[PDB]
Amino acid sequence: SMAEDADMRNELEEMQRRADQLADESLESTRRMLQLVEESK
């Protein structure tokens, strides 16, 4: 009388890597491009 094994509930897909600061950096460059393009006119 030993509770038999149980099937692994399932998989809950969840993926997180290095986006935060990589895209914040990406942004800081576009802003400066915009400023320069504005300045030229």
Partner: protein, 139 residues
């Protein structure tokens, strides 16, 4: 000097002389002269392809000068200015003053301050423009 230049048939300098005269006059809180000179310069430069685009700045200056008169006609003035120069809508100045008027309609100084701060951050403002903006704020 401008009258002499006109009498000498020497153009392209009377326009700048009148522009500088209007810019100086607006300092002393005299709007009618400034409005007339700015609109004259704008209509003179509208048909010139070289200065046609720059005419938008003159219209914006005139609108700013006309803003202090009263909001009721200022909106109409902006609409009229937009009507004669529909390309004026492309310039960010139209939306800028629209947001400023929206903020002022309910004494919401926070929105106007935010808009002015954003405009300064994106591009530097002139001393005369900053003075006019602060004067409008005092309203």
């Amino acid at each position: 000097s401008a009258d002499y230049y006109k009498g000498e048939e020497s153009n392209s300098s009377a326009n700048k002389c009148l522009l500088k005269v209007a810019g100086y006059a607006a300092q002393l809180e005299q709007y009618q002269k400034a409005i007339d000179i700015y609109e004259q310069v704008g209509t003179s430069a509208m048909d010139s392809p070289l200065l046609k685009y720059s005419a938008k700045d003159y219209f914006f200056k005139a609108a700013l000068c006309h803003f202090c008169i009263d909001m009721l006609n200022a909106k109409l003035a902006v609409q009229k200015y937009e009507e004669l120069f529909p390309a004026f809508s492309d310039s960010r100045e139209c939306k800028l003053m629209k947001k400023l008027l929206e903020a002022h309609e309910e004494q919401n100084v926070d929105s106007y301050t935010e808009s002015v701060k954003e405009y300064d951050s994106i591009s530097r403002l002139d001393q005369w423009l900053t003075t006019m903006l602060l004067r409008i704020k005092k309203t």
